[PDB]
């Protein structure tokens with residue numbers, strides 16, 4: 354693209370290469386995404402108007418030469434590297450709470466417009482020096498489906514995937530995003546992924562092992578989902594105090610609601626913003642290494 358000067362490759366999404374680049378007329382540095390169906394162009398252009406302080410701004414959509422490029426605001430780090438970087442000591446809780454609170458704000462906005470992310474994970478949560486956290490690639494899954502490999506044949510992570518998706522539900526809701534964000538929340542607290550599955554059954558069975566094999570008591574209609582099998586092992590549910598120590602009562606309460614099996618029982622973003630866990634939320638600034 355002639356108006357852009359590629360500074361460096363900085364990623365490789367499900368969708369393709371991500372470059373840091375600098376607008377040749379506007380001086381602007383941006384994230385340049387290389388990704389043509391009529392539908393997909395009409396879906397992306399909706400995304401241009403879906404603006405929020407906790408959503409990485411889509412600056413431009415360039416359709417030229419049957420190539421598609423998306424230009425986003427550039428942020429210098431993602432939550433994955435920040436988490437690796439804070440492995441030895443952990444993210445201080447007040448910072449974890451701030452990030453969760455901002456991310457729920459993002460989702461509450463998106464969801465109010467009936468837009469899902471579908472593929473939340475630490476690598477798509479982008480952090481700045483100001484104590485801000487933003488959701489990247491929002492709305493991209495519906496525009497281009499969610500691949501098993503990346504264009505680089507990289508394996509797409511299952512770790513944050515909701516059970517109803519794993520169980521073959523076609524028509525899933527905004528609750529899928531709540532699940533993922535609860536998995537990330539647990540991960541920030543404990544410094545280990547909650548459910549690090551390396552296939553779909555392994556991901557489903559890691560879920561069942563911590564939370565209990567769902568049944569018709571806790572999840573009405575589960576046994577009639579497309580990929581449910583009566584032969585599932587029946588595992589007992591673990592208590593959360595074992596799952597996420599040393600998270601406090603409020604956090605653990607909030608966490609369990611974000612991880613309800615039944616997508617209709619699972620906490621909404623808007624209702625999670627009201628949880629008393631956030632009573633004393635503040636906005637710390639992280640110490641970063643640019």
Ligand SMILES: N#Cc1cnn2cccnc12
Nearest residue numbers: 364384425426427428489
């Ligand atoms: N999409 C996107 C995006 C915006 N800023 N970024 C920095 C690093 C990696 N990806 C991005």
